mmCIF file of N, CA, C and O in Angstrom:
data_model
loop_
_atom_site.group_PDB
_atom_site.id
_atom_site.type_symbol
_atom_site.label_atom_id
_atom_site.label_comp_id
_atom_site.label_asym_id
_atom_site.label_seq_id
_atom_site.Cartn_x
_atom_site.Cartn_y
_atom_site.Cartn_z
ATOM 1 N N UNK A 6 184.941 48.368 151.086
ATOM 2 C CA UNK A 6 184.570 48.618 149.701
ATOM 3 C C UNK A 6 184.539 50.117 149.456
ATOM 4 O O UNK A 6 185.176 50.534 148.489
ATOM 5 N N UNK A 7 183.864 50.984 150.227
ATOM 6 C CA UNK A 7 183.352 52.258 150.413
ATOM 7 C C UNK A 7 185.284 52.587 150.197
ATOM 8 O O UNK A 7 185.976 52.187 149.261
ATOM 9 N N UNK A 8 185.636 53.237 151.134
ATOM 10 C CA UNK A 8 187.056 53.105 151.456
ATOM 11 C C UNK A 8 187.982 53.226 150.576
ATOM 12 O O UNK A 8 188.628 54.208 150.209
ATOM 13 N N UNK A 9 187.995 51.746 150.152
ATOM 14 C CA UNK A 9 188.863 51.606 148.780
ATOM 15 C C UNK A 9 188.368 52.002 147.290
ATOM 16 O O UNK A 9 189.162 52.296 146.396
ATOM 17 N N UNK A 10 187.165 51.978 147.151
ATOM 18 C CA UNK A 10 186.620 53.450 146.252
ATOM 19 C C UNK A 10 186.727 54.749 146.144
ATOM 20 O O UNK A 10 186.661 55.446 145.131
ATOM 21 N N UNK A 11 186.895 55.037 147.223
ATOM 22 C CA UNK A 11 187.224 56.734 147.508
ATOM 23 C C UNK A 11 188.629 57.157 147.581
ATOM 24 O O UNK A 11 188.893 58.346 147.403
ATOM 25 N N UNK A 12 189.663 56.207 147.853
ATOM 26 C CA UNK A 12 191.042 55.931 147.796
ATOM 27 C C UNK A 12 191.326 56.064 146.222
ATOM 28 O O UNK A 12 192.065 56.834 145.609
ATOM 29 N N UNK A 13 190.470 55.033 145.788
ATOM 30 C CA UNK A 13 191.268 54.990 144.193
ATOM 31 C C UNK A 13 190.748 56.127 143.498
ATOM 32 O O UNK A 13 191.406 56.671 142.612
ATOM 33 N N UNK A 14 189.600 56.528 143.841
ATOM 34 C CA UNK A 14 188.874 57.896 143.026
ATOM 35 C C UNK A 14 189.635 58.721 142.795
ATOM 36 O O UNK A 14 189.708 59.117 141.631
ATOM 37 N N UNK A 15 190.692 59.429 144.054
ATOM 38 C CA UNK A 15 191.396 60.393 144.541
ATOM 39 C C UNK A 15 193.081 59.746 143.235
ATOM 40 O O UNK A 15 193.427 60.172 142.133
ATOM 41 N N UNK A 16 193.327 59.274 143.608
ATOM 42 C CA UNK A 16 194.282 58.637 142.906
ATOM 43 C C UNK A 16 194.184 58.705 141.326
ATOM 44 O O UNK A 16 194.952 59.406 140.666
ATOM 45 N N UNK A 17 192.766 57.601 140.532
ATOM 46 C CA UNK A 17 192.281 57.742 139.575
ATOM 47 C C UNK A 17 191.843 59.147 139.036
ATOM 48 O O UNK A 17 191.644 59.296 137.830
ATOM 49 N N UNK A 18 191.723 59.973 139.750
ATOM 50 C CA UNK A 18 191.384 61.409 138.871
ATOM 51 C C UNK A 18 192.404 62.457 138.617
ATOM 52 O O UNK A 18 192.243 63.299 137.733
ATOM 53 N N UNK A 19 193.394 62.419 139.340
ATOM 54 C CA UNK A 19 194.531 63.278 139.864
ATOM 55 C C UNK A 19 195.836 62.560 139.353
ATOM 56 O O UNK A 19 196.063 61.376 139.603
ATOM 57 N N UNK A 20 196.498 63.194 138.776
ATOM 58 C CA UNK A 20 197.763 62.781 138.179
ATOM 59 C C UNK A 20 198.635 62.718 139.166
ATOM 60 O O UNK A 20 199.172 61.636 139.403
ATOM 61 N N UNK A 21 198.934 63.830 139.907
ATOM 62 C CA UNK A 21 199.697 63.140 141.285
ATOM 63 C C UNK A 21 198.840 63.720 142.534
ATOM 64 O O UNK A 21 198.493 64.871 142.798
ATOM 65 N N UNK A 22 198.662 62.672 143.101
ATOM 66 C CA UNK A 22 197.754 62.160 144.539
ATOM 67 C C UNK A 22 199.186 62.388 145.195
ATOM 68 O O UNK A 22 200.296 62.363 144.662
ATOM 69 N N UNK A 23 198.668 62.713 147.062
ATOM 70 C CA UNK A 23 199.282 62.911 147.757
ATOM 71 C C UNK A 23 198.425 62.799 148.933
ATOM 72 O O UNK A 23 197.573 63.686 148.994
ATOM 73 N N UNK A 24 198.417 61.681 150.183
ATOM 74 C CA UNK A 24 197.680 61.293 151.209
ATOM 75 C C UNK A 24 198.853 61.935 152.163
ATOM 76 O O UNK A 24 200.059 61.711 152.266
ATOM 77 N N UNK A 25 198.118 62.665 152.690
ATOM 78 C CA UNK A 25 198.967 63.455 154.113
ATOM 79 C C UNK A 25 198.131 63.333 155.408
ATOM 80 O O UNK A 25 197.016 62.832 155.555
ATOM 81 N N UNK A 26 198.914 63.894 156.272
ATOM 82 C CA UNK A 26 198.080 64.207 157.563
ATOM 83 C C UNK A 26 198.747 65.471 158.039
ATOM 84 O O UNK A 26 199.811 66.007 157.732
ATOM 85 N N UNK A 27 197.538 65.858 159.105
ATOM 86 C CA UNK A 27 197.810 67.526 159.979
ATOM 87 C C UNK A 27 199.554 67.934 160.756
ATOM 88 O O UNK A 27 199.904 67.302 161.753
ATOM 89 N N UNK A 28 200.260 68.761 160.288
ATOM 90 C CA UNK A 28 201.031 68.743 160.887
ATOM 91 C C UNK A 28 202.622 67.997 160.772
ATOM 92 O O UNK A 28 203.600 67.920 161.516
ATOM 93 N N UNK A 29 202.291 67.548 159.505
ATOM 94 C CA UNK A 29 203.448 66.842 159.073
ATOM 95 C C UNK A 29 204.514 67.431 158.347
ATOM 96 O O UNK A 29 204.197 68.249 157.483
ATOM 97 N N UNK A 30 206.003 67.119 158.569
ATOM 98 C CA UNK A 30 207.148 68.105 157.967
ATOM 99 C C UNK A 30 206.988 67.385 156.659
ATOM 100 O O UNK A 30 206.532 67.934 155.656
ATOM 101 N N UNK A 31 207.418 66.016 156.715
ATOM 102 C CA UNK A 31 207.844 65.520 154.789
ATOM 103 C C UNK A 31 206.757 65.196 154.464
ATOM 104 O O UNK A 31 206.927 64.423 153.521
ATOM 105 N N UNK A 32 205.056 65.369 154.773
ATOM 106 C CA UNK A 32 204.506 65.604 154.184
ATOM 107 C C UNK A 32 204.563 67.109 153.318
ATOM 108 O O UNK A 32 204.697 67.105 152.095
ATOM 109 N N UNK A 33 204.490 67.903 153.808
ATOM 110 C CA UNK A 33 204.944 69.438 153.582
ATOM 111 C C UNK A 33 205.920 69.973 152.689
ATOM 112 O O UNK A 33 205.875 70.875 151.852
ATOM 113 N N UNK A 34 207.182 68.871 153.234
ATOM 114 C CA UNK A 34 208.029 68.645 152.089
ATOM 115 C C UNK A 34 208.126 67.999 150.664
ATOM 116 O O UNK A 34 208.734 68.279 149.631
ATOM 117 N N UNK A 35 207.370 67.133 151.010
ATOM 118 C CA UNK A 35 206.691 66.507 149.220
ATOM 119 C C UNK A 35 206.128 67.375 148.548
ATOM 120 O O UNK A 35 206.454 67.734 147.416
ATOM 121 N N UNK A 36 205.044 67.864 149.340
ATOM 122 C CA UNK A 36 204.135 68.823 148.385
ATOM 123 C C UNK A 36 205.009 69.991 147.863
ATOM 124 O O UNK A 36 205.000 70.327 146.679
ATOM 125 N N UNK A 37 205.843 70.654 148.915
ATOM 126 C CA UNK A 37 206.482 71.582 148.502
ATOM 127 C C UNK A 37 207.399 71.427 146.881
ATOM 128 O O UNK A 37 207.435 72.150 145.885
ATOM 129 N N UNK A 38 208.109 70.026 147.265
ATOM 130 C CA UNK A 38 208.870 69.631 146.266
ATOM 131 C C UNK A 38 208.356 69.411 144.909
ATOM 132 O O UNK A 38 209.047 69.797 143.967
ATOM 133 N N UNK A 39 207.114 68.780 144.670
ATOM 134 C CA UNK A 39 206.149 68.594 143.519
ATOM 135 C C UNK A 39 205.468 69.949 143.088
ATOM 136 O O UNK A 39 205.026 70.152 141.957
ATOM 137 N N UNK A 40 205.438 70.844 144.124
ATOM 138 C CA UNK A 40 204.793 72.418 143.222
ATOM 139 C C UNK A 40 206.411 73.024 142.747
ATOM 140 O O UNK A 40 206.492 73.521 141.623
ATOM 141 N N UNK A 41 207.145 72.991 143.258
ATOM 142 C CA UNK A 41 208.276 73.330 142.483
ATOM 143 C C UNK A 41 208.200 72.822 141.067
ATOM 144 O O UNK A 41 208.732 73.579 140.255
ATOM 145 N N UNK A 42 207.743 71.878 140.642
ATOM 146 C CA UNK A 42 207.405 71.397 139.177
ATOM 147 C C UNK A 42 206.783 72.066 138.475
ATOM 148 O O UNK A 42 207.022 72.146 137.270
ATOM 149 N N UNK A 43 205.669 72.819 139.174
ATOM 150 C CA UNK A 43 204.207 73.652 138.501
ATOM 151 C C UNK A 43 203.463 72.871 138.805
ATOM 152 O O UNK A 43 202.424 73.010 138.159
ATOM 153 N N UNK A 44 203.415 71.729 139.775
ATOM 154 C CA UNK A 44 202.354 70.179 139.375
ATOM 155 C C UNK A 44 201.051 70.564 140.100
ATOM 156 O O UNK A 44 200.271 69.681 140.457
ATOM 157 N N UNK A 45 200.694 72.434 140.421
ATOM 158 C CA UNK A 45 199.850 72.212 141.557
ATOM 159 C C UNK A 45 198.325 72.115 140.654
ATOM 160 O O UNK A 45 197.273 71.943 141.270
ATOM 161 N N UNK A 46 198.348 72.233 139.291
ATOM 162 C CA UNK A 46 197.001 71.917 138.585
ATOM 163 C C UNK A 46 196.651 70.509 138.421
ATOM 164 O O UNK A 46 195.488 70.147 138.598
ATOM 165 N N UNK A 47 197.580 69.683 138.093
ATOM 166 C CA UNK A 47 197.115 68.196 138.313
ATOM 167 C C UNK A 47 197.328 67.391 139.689
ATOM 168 O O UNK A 47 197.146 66.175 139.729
ATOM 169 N N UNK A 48 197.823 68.321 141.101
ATOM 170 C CA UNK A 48 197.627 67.943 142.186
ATOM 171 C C UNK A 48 196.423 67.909 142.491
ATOM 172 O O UNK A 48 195.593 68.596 141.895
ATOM 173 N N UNK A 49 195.945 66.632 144.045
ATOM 174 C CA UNK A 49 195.334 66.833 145.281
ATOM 175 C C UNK A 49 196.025 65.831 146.253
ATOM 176 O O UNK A 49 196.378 64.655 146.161
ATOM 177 N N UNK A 50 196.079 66.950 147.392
ATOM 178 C CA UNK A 50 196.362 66.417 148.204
ATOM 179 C C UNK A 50 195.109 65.719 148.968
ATOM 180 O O UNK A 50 193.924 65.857 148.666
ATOM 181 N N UNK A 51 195.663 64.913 150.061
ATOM 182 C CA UNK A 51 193.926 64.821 151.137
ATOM 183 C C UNK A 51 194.678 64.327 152.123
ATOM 184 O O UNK A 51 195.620 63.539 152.037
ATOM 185 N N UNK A 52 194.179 64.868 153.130
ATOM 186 C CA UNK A 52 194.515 65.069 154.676
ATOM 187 C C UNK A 52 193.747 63.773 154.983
ATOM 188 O O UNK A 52 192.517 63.751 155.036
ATOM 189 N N UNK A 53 194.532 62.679 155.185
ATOM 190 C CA UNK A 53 193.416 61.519 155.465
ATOM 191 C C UNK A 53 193.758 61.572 157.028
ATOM 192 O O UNK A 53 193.342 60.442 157.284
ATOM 193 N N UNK A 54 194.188 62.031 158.199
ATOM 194 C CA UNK A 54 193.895 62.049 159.429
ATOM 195 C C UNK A 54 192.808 62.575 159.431
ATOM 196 O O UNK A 54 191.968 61.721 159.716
ATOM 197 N N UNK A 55 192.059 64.204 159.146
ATOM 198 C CA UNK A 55 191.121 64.414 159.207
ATOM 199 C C UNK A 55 189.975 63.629 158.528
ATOM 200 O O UNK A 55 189.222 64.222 157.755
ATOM 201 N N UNK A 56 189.832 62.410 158.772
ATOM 202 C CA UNK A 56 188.777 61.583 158.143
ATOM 203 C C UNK A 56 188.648 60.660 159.274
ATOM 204 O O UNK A 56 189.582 60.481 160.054
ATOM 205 N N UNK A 57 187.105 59.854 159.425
ATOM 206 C CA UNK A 57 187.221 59.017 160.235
ATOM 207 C C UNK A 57 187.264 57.790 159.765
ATOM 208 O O UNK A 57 186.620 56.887 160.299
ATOM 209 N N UNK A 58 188.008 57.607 158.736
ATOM 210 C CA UNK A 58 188.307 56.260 158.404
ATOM 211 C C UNK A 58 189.548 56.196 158.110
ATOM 212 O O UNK A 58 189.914 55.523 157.147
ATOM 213 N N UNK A 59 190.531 56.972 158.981
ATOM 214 C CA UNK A 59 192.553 56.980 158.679
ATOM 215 C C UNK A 59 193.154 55.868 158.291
ATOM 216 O O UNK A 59 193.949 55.693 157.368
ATOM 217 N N UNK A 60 192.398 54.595 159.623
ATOM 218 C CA UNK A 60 192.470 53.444 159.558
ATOM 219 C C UNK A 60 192.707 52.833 158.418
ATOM 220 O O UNK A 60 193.718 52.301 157.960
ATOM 221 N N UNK A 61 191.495 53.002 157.970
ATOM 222 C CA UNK A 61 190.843 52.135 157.101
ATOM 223 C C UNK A 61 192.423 52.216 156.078
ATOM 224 O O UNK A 61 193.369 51.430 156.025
ATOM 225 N N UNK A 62 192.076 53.969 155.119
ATOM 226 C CA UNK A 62 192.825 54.289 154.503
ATOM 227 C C UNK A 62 193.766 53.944 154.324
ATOM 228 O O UNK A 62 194.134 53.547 153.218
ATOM 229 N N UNK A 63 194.744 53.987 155.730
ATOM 230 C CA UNK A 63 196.478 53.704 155.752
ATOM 231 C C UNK A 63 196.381 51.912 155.399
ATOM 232 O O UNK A 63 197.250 51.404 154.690
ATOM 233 N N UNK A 64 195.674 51.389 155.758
ATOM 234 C CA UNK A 64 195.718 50.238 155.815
ATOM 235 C C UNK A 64 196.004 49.484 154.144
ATOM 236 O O UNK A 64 196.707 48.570 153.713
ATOM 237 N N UNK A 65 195.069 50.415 153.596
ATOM 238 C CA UNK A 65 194.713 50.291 152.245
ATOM 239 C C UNK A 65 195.930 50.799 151.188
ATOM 240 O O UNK A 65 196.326 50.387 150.098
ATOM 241 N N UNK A 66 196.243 51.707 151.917
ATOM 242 C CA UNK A 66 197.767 52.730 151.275
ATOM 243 C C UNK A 66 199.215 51.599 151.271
ATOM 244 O O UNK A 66 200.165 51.561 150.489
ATOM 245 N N UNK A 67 198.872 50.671 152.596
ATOM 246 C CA UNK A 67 199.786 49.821 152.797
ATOM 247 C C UNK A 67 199.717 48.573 151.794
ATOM 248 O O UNK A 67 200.722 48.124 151.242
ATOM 249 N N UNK A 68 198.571 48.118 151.637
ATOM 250 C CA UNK A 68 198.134 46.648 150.888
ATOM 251 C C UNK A 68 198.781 47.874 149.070
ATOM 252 O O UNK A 68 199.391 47.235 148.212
ATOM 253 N N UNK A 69 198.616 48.929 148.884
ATOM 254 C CA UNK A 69 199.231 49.575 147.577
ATOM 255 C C UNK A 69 200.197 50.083 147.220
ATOM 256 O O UNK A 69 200.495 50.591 146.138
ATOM 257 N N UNK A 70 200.973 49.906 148.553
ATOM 258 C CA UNK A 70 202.501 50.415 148.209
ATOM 259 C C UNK A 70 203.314 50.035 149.011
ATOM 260 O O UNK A 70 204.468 50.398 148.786
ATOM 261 N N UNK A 71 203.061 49.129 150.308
ATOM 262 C CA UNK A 71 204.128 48.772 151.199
ATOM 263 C C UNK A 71 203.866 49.091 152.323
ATOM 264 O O UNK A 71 203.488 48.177 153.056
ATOM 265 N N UNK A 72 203.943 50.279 152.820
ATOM 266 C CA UNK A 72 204.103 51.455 153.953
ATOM 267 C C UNK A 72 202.491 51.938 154.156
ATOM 268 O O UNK A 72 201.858 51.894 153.101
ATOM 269 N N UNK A 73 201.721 52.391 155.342
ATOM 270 C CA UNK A 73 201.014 52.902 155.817
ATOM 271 C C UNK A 73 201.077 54.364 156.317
ATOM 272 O O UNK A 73 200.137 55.074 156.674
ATOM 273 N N UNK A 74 202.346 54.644 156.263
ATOM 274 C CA UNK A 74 202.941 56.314 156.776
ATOM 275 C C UNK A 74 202.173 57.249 155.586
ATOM 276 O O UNK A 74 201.574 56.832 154.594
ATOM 277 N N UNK A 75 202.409 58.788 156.056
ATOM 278 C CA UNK A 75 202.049 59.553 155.213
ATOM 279 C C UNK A 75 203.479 60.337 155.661
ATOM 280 O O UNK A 75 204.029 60.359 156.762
ATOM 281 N N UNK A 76 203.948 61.096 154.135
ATOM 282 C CA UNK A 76 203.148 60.987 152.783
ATOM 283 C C UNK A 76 203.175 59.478 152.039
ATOM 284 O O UNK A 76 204.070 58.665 152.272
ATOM 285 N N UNK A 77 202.187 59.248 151.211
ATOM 286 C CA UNK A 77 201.984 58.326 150.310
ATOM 287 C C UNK A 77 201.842 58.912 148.973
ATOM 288 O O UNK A 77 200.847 59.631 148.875
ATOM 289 N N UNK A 78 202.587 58.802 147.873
ATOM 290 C CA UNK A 78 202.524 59.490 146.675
ATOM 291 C C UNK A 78 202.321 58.758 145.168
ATOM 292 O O UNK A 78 203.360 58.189 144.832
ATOM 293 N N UNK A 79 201.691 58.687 144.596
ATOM 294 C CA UNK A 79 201.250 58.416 143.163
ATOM 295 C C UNK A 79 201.418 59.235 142.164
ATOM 296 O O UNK A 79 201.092 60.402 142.385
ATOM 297 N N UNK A 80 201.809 58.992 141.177
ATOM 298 C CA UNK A 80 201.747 59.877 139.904
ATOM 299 C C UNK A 80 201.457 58.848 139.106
ATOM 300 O O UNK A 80 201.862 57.687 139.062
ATOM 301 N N UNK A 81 200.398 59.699 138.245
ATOM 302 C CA UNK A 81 199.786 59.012 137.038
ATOM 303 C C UNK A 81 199.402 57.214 137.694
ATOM 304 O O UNK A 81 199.344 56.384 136.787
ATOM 305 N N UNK A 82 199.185 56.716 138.993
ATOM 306 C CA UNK A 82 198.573 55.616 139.179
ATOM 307 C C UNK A 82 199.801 54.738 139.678
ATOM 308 O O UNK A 82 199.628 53.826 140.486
ATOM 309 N N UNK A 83 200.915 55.023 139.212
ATOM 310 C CA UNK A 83 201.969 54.762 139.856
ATOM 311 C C UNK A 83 202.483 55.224 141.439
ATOM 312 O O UNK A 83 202.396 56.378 141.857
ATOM 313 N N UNK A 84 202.973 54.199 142.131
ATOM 314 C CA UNK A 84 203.617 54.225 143.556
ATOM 315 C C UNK A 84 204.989 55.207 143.400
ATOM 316 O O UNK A 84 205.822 54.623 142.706
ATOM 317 N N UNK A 85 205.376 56.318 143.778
ATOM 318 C CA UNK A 85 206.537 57.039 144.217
ATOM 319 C C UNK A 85 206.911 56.211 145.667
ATOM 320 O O UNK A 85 207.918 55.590 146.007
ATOM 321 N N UNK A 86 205.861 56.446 146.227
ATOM 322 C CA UNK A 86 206.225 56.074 147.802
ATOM 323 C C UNK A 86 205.816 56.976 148.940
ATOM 324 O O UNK A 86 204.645 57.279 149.169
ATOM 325 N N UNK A 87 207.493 57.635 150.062
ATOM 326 C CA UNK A 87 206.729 58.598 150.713
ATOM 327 C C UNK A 87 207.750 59.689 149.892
ATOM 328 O O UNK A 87 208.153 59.644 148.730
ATOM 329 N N UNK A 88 208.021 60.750 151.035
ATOM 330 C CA UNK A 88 209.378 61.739 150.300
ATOM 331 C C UNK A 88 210.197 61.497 150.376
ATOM 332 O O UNK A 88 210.891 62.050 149.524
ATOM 333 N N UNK A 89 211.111 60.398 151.466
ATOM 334 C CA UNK A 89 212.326 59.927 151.148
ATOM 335 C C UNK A 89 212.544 59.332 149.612
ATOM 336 O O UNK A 89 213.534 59.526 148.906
ATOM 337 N N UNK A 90 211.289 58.507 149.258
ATOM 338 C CA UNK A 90 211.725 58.039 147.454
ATOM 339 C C UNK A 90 211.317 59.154 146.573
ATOM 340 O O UNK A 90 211.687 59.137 145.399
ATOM 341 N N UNK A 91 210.602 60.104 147.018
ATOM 342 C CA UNK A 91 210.666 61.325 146.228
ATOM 343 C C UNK A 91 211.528 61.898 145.779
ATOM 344 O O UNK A 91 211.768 62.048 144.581
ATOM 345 N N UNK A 92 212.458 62.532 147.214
ATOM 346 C CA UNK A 92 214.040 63.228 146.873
ATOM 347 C C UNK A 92 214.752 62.003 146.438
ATOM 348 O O UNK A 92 215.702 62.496 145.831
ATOM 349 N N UNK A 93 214.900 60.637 146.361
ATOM 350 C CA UNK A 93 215.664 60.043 145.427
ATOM 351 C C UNK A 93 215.967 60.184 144.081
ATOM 352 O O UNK A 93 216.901 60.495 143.340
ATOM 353 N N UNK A 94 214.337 59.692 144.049
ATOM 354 C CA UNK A 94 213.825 59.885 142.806
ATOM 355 C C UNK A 94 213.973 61.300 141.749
ATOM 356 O O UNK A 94 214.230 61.295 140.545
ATOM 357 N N UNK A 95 213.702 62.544 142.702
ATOM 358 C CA UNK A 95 213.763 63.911 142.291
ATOM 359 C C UNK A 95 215.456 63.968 142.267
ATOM 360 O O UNK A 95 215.807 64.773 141.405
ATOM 361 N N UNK A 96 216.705 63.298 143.020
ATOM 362 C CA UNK A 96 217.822 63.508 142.920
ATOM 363 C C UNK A 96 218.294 62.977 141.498
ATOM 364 O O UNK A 96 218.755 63.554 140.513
ATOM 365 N N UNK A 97 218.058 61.917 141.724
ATOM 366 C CA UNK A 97 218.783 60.707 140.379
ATOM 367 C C UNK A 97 218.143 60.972 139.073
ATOM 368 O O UNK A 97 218.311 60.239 138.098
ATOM 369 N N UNK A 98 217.050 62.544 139.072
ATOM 370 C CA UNK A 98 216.361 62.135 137.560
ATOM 371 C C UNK A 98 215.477 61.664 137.235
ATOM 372 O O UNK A 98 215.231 61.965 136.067
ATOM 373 N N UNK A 99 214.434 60.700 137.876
ATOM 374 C CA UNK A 99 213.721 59.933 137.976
ATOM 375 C C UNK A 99 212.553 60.345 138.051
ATOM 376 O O UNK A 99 211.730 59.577 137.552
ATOM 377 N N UNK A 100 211.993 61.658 138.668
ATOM 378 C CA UNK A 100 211.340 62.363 138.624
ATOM 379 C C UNK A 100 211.479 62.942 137.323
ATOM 380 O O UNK A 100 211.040 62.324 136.353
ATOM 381 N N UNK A 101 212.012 64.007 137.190
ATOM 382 C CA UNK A 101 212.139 64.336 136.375
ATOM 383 C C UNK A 101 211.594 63.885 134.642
ATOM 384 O O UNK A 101 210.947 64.612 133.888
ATOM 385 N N UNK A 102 212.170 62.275 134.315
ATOM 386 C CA UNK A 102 211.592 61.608 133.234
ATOM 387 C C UNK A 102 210.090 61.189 133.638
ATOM 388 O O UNK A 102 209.296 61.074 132.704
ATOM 389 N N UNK A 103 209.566 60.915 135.141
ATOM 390 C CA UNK A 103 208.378 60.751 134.530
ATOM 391 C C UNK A 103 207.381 61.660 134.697
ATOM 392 O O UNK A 103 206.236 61.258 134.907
ATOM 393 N N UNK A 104 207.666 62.984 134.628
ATOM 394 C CA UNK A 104 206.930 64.159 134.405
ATOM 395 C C UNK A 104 207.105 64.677 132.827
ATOM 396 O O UNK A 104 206.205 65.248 132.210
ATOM 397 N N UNK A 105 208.137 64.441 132.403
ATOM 398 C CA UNK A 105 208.109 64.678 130.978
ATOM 399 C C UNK A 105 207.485 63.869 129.802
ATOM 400 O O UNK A 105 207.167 64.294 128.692
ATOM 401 N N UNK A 106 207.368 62.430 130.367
ATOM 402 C CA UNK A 106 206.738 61.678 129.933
ATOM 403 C C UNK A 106 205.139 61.891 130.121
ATOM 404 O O UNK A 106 204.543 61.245 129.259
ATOM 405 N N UNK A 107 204.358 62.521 130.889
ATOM 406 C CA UNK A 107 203.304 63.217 131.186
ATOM 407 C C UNK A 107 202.810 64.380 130.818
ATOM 408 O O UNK A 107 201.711 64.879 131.059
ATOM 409 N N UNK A 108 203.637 64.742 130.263
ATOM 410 C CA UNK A 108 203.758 66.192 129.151
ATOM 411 C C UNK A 108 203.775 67.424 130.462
ATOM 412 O O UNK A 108 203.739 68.579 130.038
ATOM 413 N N UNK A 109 203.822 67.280 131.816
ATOM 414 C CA UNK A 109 204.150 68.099 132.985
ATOM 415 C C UNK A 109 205.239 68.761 133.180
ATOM 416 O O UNK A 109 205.114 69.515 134.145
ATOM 417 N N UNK A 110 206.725 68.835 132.461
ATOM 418 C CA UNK A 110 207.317 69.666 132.287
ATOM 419 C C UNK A 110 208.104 69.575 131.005
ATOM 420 O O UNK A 110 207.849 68.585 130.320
ATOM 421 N N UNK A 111 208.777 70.198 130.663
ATOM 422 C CA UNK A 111 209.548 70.434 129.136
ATOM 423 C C UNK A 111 210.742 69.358 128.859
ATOM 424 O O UNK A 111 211.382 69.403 127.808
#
């Protein structure tokens, strides 16, 4: 319960959420790719390895989008995925419309 409250909080307050862990390249690379937007005022990230409930978390990340890996990405409450559907998404445009639709870029 605890868990999945603090999951959606992070999500629910933040226009795009980003669950990472220590040491990760396409975590690194997502984020990198989403501040290229300007998105770093309606970002947070959260390092959910440094937590002692990773478990819990990934588990929970999985029952909300498929996958348990990090990165795990949301915008506006919506599933992106990890960064492989990011750079899709950021390739084909897709990104793109739903940041404009968010009033996040021009």
């Amino acid at each position: 319960e605890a868990v999945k409250k603090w999951v959606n909080k992070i999500i629910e307050e933040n226009i795009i959420a980003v669950f990472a862990k220590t040491e990760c390249p396409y975590c690194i690379k997502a984020i990198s790719i989403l501040k290229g937007y300007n998105l770093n005022s309606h970002m947070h990230v959260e390092n959910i390895e440094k937590n002692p409930d990773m478990a819990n978390i990934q588990a929970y990340l999985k029952e909300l989008t498929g996958k348990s890996s990090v990165p795990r990405i949301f915008i506006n409450k919506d599933v992106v995925g990890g960064c492989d559907d990011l750079v899709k998404e950021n390739d084909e445009g897709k990104l793109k419309e739903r940041l404009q639709k968010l009033g996040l870029v021009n």
